[PDB]
Amino acid sequence: DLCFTNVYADSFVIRGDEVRQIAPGQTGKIADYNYKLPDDFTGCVIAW
Amino acid sequence: EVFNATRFASVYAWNRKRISNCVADYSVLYNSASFSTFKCYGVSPTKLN
Numbered sequence: 001d002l003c004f005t006n007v008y009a010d011s012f013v014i015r016g017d018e019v020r021q022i023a024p025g026q027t028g029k030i031a032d033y034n035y036k037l038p039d040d041f042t043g044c045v046i047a048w
Numbered sequence: 049e050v051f052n053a054t055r056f057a058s059v060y061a062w063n064r065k066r067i068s069n070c071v072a073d074y075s076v077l078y079n080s081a082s083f084s085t086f087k088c089y090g091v092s093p094t095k096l097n
């Protein structure tokens with residue numbers, strides 16, 4: 001029941017044990033050198 | 049000697065070890081170790097450095 005403004009989709013592949021790293025904090029190999037989310041994040045994360 | 053050891057202990061006789069006089073640079077674990085669970089409680093991970 002909402003309408004969204006500036007929708008961007010980002011895509012990639014990783015290893016299972018690294019999925020917990022896709023979150024605002026979460027230091028680690030993936031979050032320090034490859035992909036980082038901000039602290040003021042509005043959106044959704046999906047993995048399969 | 050802690051993470052890449054040879055035999056671990058039983059949960060009923062769990063082992064305990066002291067650590068002192070050392071530099072805690074954990075990025076040396078990135079090349080070899082892959083943890084399934086990691087959770088810190090009274091501290092944020094982005095500040096451990």
Ligand SMILES: CCCCC/C=C\C/C=C\CCCCCCCC(=O)O
Binds near residue numbers: 028050067072086096
């Ligand atoms: C061998 C005992 C070392 C004593 C460490 C004491 C304080 C530092 C606390 C936590 C760092 C441990 C490594 C965190 C796991 C690596 C993942 C990462 O965050 O990149």
Ligand SMILES: *[C@@H]1O[C@H](CO)[C@@H](O)[C@H](O)[C@H]1NC(C)=O
Binds near residue numbers: 052
């Ligand atoms: C332990 O030895 C080295 C130390 O980093 C590590 O690369 C290797 O994968 C480990 N071997 C074992 C116990 O599987």
